[PDB]
Amino acid sequence: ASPFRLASAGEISEVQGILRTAGLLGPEKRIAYLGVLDPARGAGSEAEDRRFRVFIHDVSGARPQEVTVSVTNGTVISAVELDTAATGELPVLEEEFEVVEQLLATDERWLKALAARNLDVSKVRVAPLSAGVFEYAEERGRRILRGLAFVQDFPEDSAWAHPVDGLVAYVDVVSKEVTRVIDTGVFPVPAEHGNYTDPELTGPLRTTQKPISITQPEGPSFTVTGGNHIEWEKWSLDVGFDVREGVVLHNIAFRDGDRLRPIINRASIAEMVVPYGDPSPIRSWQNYFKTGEYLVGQYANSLELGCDCLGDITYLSPVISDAFGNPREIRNGICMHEEDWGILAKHSDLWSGINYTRRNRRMVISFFTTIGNYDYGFYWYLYLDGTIEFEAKATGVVFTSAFPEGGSDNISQLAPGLGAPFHQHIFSARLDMAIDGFTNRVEEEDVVRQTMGPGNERGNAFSRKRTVLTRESEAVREADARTGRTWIISNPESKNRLNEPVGYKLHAHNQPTLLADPGSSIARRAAFATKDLWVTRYADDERYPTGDFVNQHSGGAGLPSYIAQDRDIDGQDIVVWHTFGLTHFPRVEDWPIMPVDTVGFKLRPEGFFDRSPVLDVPAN
Amino acid sequence: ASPFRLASAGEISEVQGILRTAGLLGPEKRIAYLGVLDPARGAGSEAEDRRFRVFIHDVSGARPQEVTVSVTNGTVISAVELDTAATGELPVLEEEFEVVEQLLATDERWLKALAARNLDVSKVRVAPLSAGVFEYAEERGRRILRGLAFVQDFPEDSAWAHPVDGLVAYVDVVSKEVTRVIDTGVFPVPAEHGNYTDPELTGPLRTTQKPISITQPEGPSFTVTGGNHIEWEKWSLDVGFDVREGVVLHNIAFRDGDRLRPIINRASIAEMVVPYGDPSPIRSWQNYFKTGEYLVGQYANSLELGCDCLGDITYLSPVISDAFGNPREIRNGICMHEEDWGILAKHSDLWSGINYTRRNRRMVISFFTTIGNYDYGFYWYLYLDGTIEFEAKATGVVFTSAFPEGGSDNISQLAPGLGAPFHQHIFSARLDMAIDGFTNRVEEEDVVRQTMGPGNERGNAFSRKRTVLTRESEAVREADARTGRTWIISNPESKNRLNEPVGYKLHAHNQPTLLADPGSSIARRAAFATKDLWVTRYADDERYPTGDFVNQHSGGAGLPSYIAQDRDIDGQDIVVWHTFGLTHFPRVEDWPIMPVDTVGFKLRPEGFFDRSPVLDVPAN
Ligand SMILES: [Cu+2]
Ligand SMILES: [Cu+2]
């Protein structure tokens, strides 16, 4: 009976029924987004009322709507018509991506471009990409997708090995018309194939790898109740799933002695943008907002035991809605398991004669998603010592282009004539903090060097300083690896036995942030990506760092708008938004299929406990 | 057979015999250091000539000597008398450490200080620490150790919980004289115990941890031949061990098709310093050069199966010399095993319909050492994809002091009246590079942001630049996390199929470097720690960033002196010295025994291969 339980197939069917009966789901309507709403602040009087938020698109050109329904009472709470030219277009529908290639196939301009290159239209695949907002005034209020071509020689061929450069088209997916076809010139289409399962490319497979058996004879140490409530080594939390954000962690708490202490109320990856840095007009508009425009949860893979998740695995099979309101289960879309994590603590003391060693372990909650050529893994980790960590694993096939004769300052060569445009993968982790409760504050901590002189005669001293972020106007921070900068979230009203506010310290990897020019469209639409840490006052309607309707929005939505309210964040209900990502200059080793690369962050207790919280761990 | 084989008990006994025969090892002599020398460059010597280098101390006060012997020919190659006041004292002898507490127990000044604090001398343990170089003229040319007191209430009590602040003594361990006893005032001695095995403190042990079984039914995938030659998933290398550096990796190479391609000739942690940042006269001289002053290898722990190393483990038991030249085995001092490392590569392609997933693995070579209250683990990893990584794991018990009543800017409070002075753990990895051979060069690579305008009208473009370090004077570099700075080691004479020099990219964690004032004794003695990367031209006698004799040695040797030669490093036999470490502001969670914290670095192939090197990994 938990308010955080996963949505059932029936609940989705109920939403569909409610919408249909209300006359909001006619033949031309499509569900672009559907997700359950989290309980509002308080809920003292559990008025069990499951509500769902829905974005309804209209393939007839009619205005879309944002609808909130109660499946508990079978009613429509609200239905507001949207003006997309102002607030943004709805997420792209899976069915719209498909129309791009089909439409271009009958367009004379597109056919002429292919004919000049001697490419069989039946062999040309088109990657349907988001459009963004640039200089095309005629696109305002219109639902546009831009297409890039790749040649697939046969059904099992990897089209990514054969990009068709110098060609790009724009399509209005509603009116179903090709608005523009741009041909800047012919580029040779890379000839080598990139079929990583072809013996001629892989060569003889290795026979040197001996098996590694990972098993748990007595089962896992974690328990799963209520379908998604996890309890493991003092940790307590609920594993949620949203079609937009994917796996979402709720009510992360730690059992300290006789009481369950909250740490984080809600943790999620609220946005993930992939901006490309190739100035060619063929791709200079390319920016993927995987979470906001595509909805990462929708493309979560069904994970295979022994392949994707090894060991004693417990799966969750979340249900999402299709474009018509029908429930669709993502079988084994979420993996949950614990794993050994080496030494936790060790000391061999000469004086006491006591030799002490203890092993560490971590709870893993993950899912993997595939969008076009991209495949990303999202992993959340909980450690015995109270550490919380997130890790993104990037793999898949690199997005390609032709490699210009004479070289390039924005593209790397992967194979003869095959290029890989430079780009970044930037994430935003939204952490609704709850350190021992909702009264929290954030301090920026920097190492402080000291000068040799009075009070420091030997010049060996060093210290640190903490600065409280009191208002949102001063809560947009940047990293400073040189000074070991971190951010501490504490509760000024909850102190440890040493009379110090309890807290958790966020450790960033300090990777580069958004590189685009400050005046670019992407810098405006993905402003969150330009700074490492943002702190806002909690608000029900502030869910994503990029706003609710990211697709083709002019910019400034999300964090920049929230921060502008300049609210008090010193000892209040606050939310931390951490930006982190990878800057990718593709290497030859990333082709034909990319070995995993990673990025993330972690938070460690900082005076949260009265002493080490793992003294009760037994000897293994 | 192999000139890179581990030293045998017989070789050590032979060195002892050769030294004795030469009249260099009488009863007053002690072996402060003994290690096998790596073979010289080029196939000079026909067969293999095994040579050992020894530092010989004299307990009567006579000048020590540095000697090189040929165990093969039974001859002394060179023997030079050392002027320690100039070039440095020899490493501390394990036998000198116990001298301190013993001598102080009968010193009137020390006894009076203890009586003023109402402490029973029989219960006062003394931590004998390296002295460094400061303003004490009488210490020049003498072997000094400085002692700090801790109370041990009973046999199995953790003395670290009871520091005796305001007191420190200096001792000449050769003449066995207490040179000075400094008492700055009585501080309350923390009363709470820190016994982590006491149920009173641990509380009932957890019974919630279910077993995790990791086994290999068909045995490990790596082979060990010649006692220390490893072959694993295309990797080839020799695992060496030196009493000073600990585990050293030799001839790291990768089998690419029909060629064994070298990558790194020698990899080791050439120095490790732990500088303290508390300006109190009681500890302002505290700087542990664990590698250079103590010799970390001799303190390597015997690792227990199922506790320290889990899974199918293969052990090496290196042999070192004791103070008299007798061989001593460190049973199971080195652990070797392979472990699963999640997903290696994955992609589910819509167009081809092919779903591909491969798992990763890594080879682990490690050892753990204990020096006083510190316990550090050194781990080297080799990955299927060609990545090489190092990781240091810090644990043990934090060094304590009293926590001043009025607070402190250089000490954190762990318990009532118990403090933990701020400090750093800084390592120097010496990487004698051999990317496809010895003709190498290093380039510093920075991300390059571009301004919106002609050629970049949308302001989305970004690039990078590479600067070749051509001479040693230009090869002392600092990190720049903000610009994603990395360093690439390439071979300008060996190109991949795309006509680009093959290389490897070094990725640093970009943690803060040495914080001490540049004019401090420690900034001069640990000069290498003030910069992130140094590149030198290979030289037989340039082994450590701090020189051969670190104990009580001022600046003048090491990296700063090597770089002065300003040698050509553009396409030559070069060595990369990477500084990396942790800055520790102790938390309450670090008490009474510290949970592991880590730091390290890694190198990934950068155009070294012609495509991904893991296409031949099976699905299994
Ligand atoms: Cu990428
Ligand atoms: Cu430390």
Interface contact flag, B587 A593, Cβ < 8 Å: no
Minimal-distance CA residue of chain B relative to A340: B212
Contact A585, B462 (CB under 8 A): no
Identity of the residue in B213, B361, B482 whose CB atom sits nearest the CB atom of A217: B213
Interface contact flag, B589 A516, Cβ < 8 Å: no
Token digits for A216? 């748990």
Where chain A is broken, by preceding residue (C–N > 2.5 Å)?
A: none
**Torsion, Cα of B110, B111, B117, B123 (10° steps):** 100
- C-alpha distances in angstroms, A498 versus A609, B187, B413, B419? 10, 19, 8, 12
B378 touches chain A (CB under 8 A): no
Token digits for B54? 């020894």
CA B101, CA B108: separation in Å to the nearest integer? 13
A122 touches chain B (CB under 8 A): no
B353 touches chain A (CB under 8 A): yes
- List the domains of chain A with CATH numbers: 1-87 (3.10.450.40), 94-195 (3.10.450.40), 196-619 (2.70.98.20)
Q: In what order do the strands lie in the sheet with B167-172?
A: B124-130, B144-151, B167-172, B177-183
Ligand nearest to the CA of B276: 2
* Omega before residue A91 within 30° of 0, cis: no
φ, ψ of residue B559 to 5 degrees: the values are -45, -45
CA A462, CA B411: separation in Å to the nearest integer? 10
Q: Which residues pair with B602 in a beta bridge?
A: B389, B507
Q: How many residues make up chain A in this entry?
A: 620
- C-alpha distances in angstroms, A161 versus A193, A194, A359, B349, B353? 6, 5, 46, 13, 16
CB-based contacts of B240, cutoff 8 Å, min separation 6:
B4, B6, B228, B247, B248, B249, B250
Q: Is the sign of the CA dihedral A486, A490, A495, A499 positive or negative?
A: positive
Residue with tokens 């001490």: B516
A47 touches chain B (CB under 8 A): no
Query: For A584, which DSSP code?
Result: E
B407 touches chain A (CB under 8 A): no
Mutation site, A458, A464, A532, interface B, largest B CB count within 10 A? A458
Q: Which residues pair with A445 in a beta bridge?
A: A466, A486
CA B536, CA B45: separation in Å to the nearest integer? 25
CA A304, CA B357: separation in Å to the nearest integer? 9
CB-based contacts of B463, cutoff 8 Å, min separation 6:
A277, A409, A410, A422, B447, B448, B450
Query: What does the H/E/C string look like for B436-451?
Result: CCCCEEEEEEEEEECC
CA A110, CA A186: separation in Å to the nearest integer? 13
- Look at residues A300, A241, A273, A240 and name the one whose alpha carbon lies nearest to residue A544: A273
DSSP run (H or E) holding A12:
helix A9-21
Residue with tokens 């509603």: A174
Rounded to the nearest 5 degrees, what angle is found at the Cα of A277, between the Cα atoms of A276 and A278?
100
CB-based contacts of B93, cutoff 8 Å, min separation 6:
B30, B32, B57, B323
Token digits for B179? 């040179």
- Look at residues B205, B368, B391, B594 and name the one whose alpha carbon lies nearest to residue A385: B594
B511 touches chain A (CB under 8 A): yes
Q: How many residues make up chain B in this entry?
A: 620
Rg (CA), chain B: 26
Rounded to the nearest 5 degrees, what angle is found at the Cα of A177, between the Cα atoms of A171 and A181?
55
Identity of the residue in B360, B515, B517 whose CB atom sits nearest the CB atom of A596: B360
How far from chain centre, in Å, is Cα B495? 34
DSSP run (H or E) holding B317:
none
Give A586 Cα–ligand 1 centroid separation in angstroms.
7
Among the residues of B118-237, which ranges form H helices?
199-202
Ligand nearest to the CA of A423: 1
Minimal-distance CA residue of chain B relative to A287: B460
CA A88, CA B378: separation in Å to the nearest integer? 53
Mutation site, A462, A478, A513, A609, interface B, largest B CB count within 10 A? A462
CB-based contacts of A136, cutoff 8 Å, min separation 6:
A170, A179, A180
- Look at residues A619, A612, A346, A353 and name the one whose alpha carbon lies nearest to residue B370: A346
- C-alpha distances in angstroms, B83 versus B87, B323, B549? 6, 21, 11
3-state secondary structure of B563: helix
Contact B322, B31 (CB under 8 A): yes
- Look at residues A580, A603, A397 and name the one whose alpha carbon lies nearest to residue A490: A603
CA A242, CA A236: separation in Å to the nearest integer? 20
Q: Parallel, antiparallel, or unpaired: how do β-strands B75-81 and B65-70 relate?
A: antiparallel
3-state secondary structure of A287: strand
Q: Parallel, antiparallel, or unpaired: how do β-strands A223-225 and A229-232 relate?
A: antiparallel
Ligand nearest to the CA of B597: 2
CA B535, CA B527: separation in Å to the nearest integer? 14
Interface contact flag, A616 B216, Cβ < 8 Å: no
Where chain B is broken, by preceding residue (C–N > 2.5 Å)?
A: none
CA B298, CA B393: separation in Å to the nearest integer? 18
Query: What does the H/E/C string look like for A305-343?
Result: ECCCECCCCEEECCEEECCCCCEEECCCCEEEEEEEEEE
A464 touches chain B (CB under 8 A): yes
CA B515, CA B529: separation in Å to the nearest integer? 9
Rounded to the nearest 5 degrees, what angle is found at the Cα of A402, between the Cα atoms of A397 and A405?
140
3-state secondary structure of B286: coil
**Torsion, Cα of A33, A331, A245, A436 (10° steps):** 130
Contact B232, B239 (CB under 8 A): no
CA B169, CA B189: separation in Å to the nearest integer? 18
How far from chain centre, in Å, is Cα B521? 21
Token digits for B247? 């585990």
> What's the farthest any 2 CA atoms get from each other in chain A?
86
CB atoms within 10 A of CB B21: 12
A235 touches chain B (CB under 8 A): no
- Look at residues A488, A371, A372 and name the one whose alpha carbon lies nearest to residue A435: A488
Contact B232, B254 (CB under 8 A): no
Exposed/middle/buried for residue B157 (C-beta within 10 Å: 0-12, 13-18, 19+): buried
Give B246 Cα–ligand 2 centroid separation in angstroms.
20
Ligand nearest to the CA of B586: 2
Number of H helices, E strands in chain B: 7, 34
CA B514, CA B161: separation in Å to the nearest integer? 28
CA A577, CA A590: separation in Å to the nearest integer? 30
φ, ψ of residue A294 to 5 degrees: the values are -95, -30
Q: Which residues pair with A322 in a beta bridge?
A: none
CB-based contacts of B576, cutoff 8 Å, min separation 6:
B429, B430, B431, B433, B442, B487, B489, B506, B533, B534, B535
Resolution in A: 1.7
Ligand nearest to the CA of B392: 2
CA B232, CA B361: separation in Å to the nearest integer? 11
Rounded to the nearest 5 degrees, what angle is found at the Cα of A519, between the Cα atoms of A275 and A587?
30
Token digits for A178? 């090709």
Residue with tokens 């004299």: B58
Contact A56, A31 (CB under 8 A): yes
How far from chain centre, in Å, is Cα A379? 10
Token digits for B373? 């209250």
- C-alpha distances in angstroms, A28 versus A61, A102, A140, B88, B358? 9, 20, 22, 86, 42
Residue with tokens 């299994």: B620
Token digits for B410? 């250089």
Minimal-distance CA residue of chain B relative to A517: B459
Rounded to the nearest 5 degrees, what angle is found at the Cα of A192, between the Cα atoms of A591 and A104?
95
Interface contact flag, B308 A346, Cβ < 8 Å: yes
Contact A172, A179 (CB under 8 A): yes
Find residues 294-313 of chain B whose CB sits inside 8 Å of chain A.
Answer: 301, 304, 306-308, 310-311
Minimal-distance CA residue of chain A relative to B610: A588
CA B124, CA B100: separation in Å to the nearest integer? 12
CA B580, CA B338: separation in Å to the nearest integer? 26
* Omega before residue B592 within 30° of 0, cis: yes
3-state secondary structure of A139: helix
Token digits for A246? 């994917």
CA A353, CA B500: separation in Å to the nearest integer? 58
CA A21, CA B606: separation in Å to the nearest integer? 60
CA A393, CA B486: separation in Å to the nearest integer? 21
Residue with tokens 């393939």: A59
Distance from CA of B280 to the nearest CA of A (A): 8
Strand positions, DSSP E, B89-192: 124-130, 144-151, 167-172, 177-183
Identity of the residue in A347, A447, A617 whose CB atom sits nearest the CB atom of B395: A347
Identity of the residue in B284, B410, B484 whose CB atom sits nearest the CB atom of A583: B484
- Look at residues A385, A383, A351, A345 and name the one whose alpha carbon lies nearest to residue B375: A345
CA B572, CA B437: separation in Å to the nearest integer? 10
CA A385, CA B313: separation in Å to the nearest integer? 26
How far from chain centre, in Å, is Cα A284? 23
Q: Parallel, antiparallel, or unpaired: how do β-strands A401-402 and A374-383 relate?
A: unpaired
Interface contact flag, B208 A591, Cβ < 8 Å: no
- Look at residues B52, B90, B46 and name the one whose alpha carbon lies nearest to residue B71: B52
Among the residues of A35-91, which ranges form H helices?
84-87
Query: For B471, which DSSP code?
Result: B
Rg (CA), chain A: 26
CB-based contacts of A347, cutoff 8 Å, min separation 6:
A355, A356, B370, B373, B375, B395, B396, B397, B593
How far from chain centre, in Å, is Cα B554? 20
Instruction: Go through A325-363 and write b for each residue having 16 or more CB atoms within 10 A of its CB, e for each that does not.
Output: bebeebebbbbbbbbbbbbbbbbbbebbebebbbbbbbb
Identity of the residue in B340, B459, B595 whose CB atom sits nearest the CB atom of A519: B459
Contacts with B259 from chain A: Cβ below 8 Å: none
3-state secondary structure of A256: strand
- Look at residues A563, A433, A409 and name the one whose alpha carbon lies nearest to residue A491: A433
Interface contact flag, A218 B210, Cβ < 8 Å: yes
Contact A438, A459 (CB under 8 A): no
Contact B487, B442 (CB under 8 A): yes
Distance from CA of B202 to the nearest CA of A (A): 5
A201 touches chain B (CB under 8 A): yes
End-to-end CA distance of chain A: 37
Size of interface A-B (CB pairs under 8 A): 445
Among the residues of B40-79, which ranges form H helices?
none
Find residues 314-343 of chain A whose CB sits inside 8 Å of chain B.
Answer: 338-340, 342-343
Find residues 525-564 of chain A whose CB sits inside 8 Å of chain B.
Answer: none
A223 touches chain B (CB under 8 A): no
Interface contact flag, A617 B306, Cβ < 8 Å: no
CB-based contacts of A59, cutoff 8 Å, min separation 6:
A28, A29, A30, A174
